[model samples]
Target: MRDLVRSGKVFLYGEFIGLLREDHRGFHFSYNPDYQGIPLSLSFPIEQSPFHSDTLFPYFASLVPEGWLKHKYALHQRIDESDMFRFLLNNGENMLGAVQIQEEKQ
Candidate 1:
């Protein structure tokens, strides 16, 4: 049993970046105004417009566990195949280019 609010805190090497949230409308990522690093992805140039996706962004998808490793994390993470957000919450600190995800407290 868990409170399932679908959001994550985005960070780059401990620097705040943005908010990534998923809902019935799918995924949305909006960079914080204070963020001044390189673009989070080529798909997301630093702009005021929030990035939208009908599905998980390819960048985050690639960070997700796959094959046997997925099962290993799934078990300990108490998450099923669909809970990619949580997987990121728990292990996304190991993300590429030193970026990471932190679970929302609520």
Candidate 2:
């Protein structure tokens, strides 16, 4: 959760789809409705308007590494296992299933 106050890119099949941001206010997710590629399967509305939540979305949560791997990682980083946003922000680039949450390379 060290970088929870920053923003991260959301990629689908290596294509930019949306963004996930977190701050003192909480988590916000927004998609590019103008995107011409395949749509996201998540239940959240697809629009430029941001969707705010006190906790991380399940769709994003599913992107994080699972089981003991996640446990040890969170422990090593001294992060809360329930802090899904932190997990995603930390391991965004690691592909899980089809979704990839990666940092914007410089």
Candidate 3:
């Protein structure tokens, strides 16, 4: 993920929502934007998944938003919705709201 952002692979040309509602419904989660999670650094990078995305985490599962889940499932059904994919990707990270997953200057 760091390479993607650092190398400028993930570029957003227009306005981005900067937030990921729990799943897709609008539920919020906790993340420290100042720091990026572990750098799995696989051949293909996987998007950062925070405590909020963890279903086993306390109070995390109940906060699940149906809309977000549905959207994810929808993707399996169809994959032509670029706009929806972009929104889900941005929202899951919460951009700069309650939590942030970008690099921390420290």
Candidate 4:
């Protein structure tokens, strides 16, 4: 998670659940930069990988916050750029079949 943030790439701003929606009910962490708040999205898939598991998944797995679990079938195994675009097009509703966080401006 720190790597992603430090990488300075567009990434998931916060945690999310396997079923969709940000996990605000448990283990909430402070935004390191001390901003008022920012848009949070599901970050997933990358040019080299089909998913963001390398970053988001590990963070999520370690936290295991409340309703989220790294289920085999529940998450995308790759970084799906197209899927990410589609989700944004929908304004965060009816997202492309993933609980993944797509690239967001860092």
RMSD in Å for all candidates: 4.7, 4.7, 13.0, 13.7
lDDT of 4 by residue, 1-106 (tens): 2222212112233434222222322222222343323333233222222233222343333323233223423664443432323333333422223234333442
lDDT of each: 0.70, 0.64, 0.33, 0.30
* Candidate 2 residue lDDT tens string, 60-87: 6666666735566554764443466666
List candidate 2 stretches off by more than 4 Å: 1-4, 47-49, 68-82, 98-106
Off by over 4 Å in 4: 1-75, 92-106
Q: lDDT of candidate 2?
A: 0.64
Off by over 4 Å in 3: 1-55, 75-98, 101-106
Instruction: Summing lDDT over every window of 10 consecutive residues in candidate 2, give the lowest-scoring window.
Output: 97-106
lDDT of 3 by residue, 10-97 (tens): 2122322133233332333333344344332232122443323322223323233556558766457643333333344445344422
Ranking by lDDT: 1, 2, 3, 4
Each model's TM-score?
0.70, 0.66, 0.23, 0.18
Return the top candidate by TM-score.
1
Number of backbone-clashing residue pairs for each candidate, in the order shown: 0, 1, 6, 16
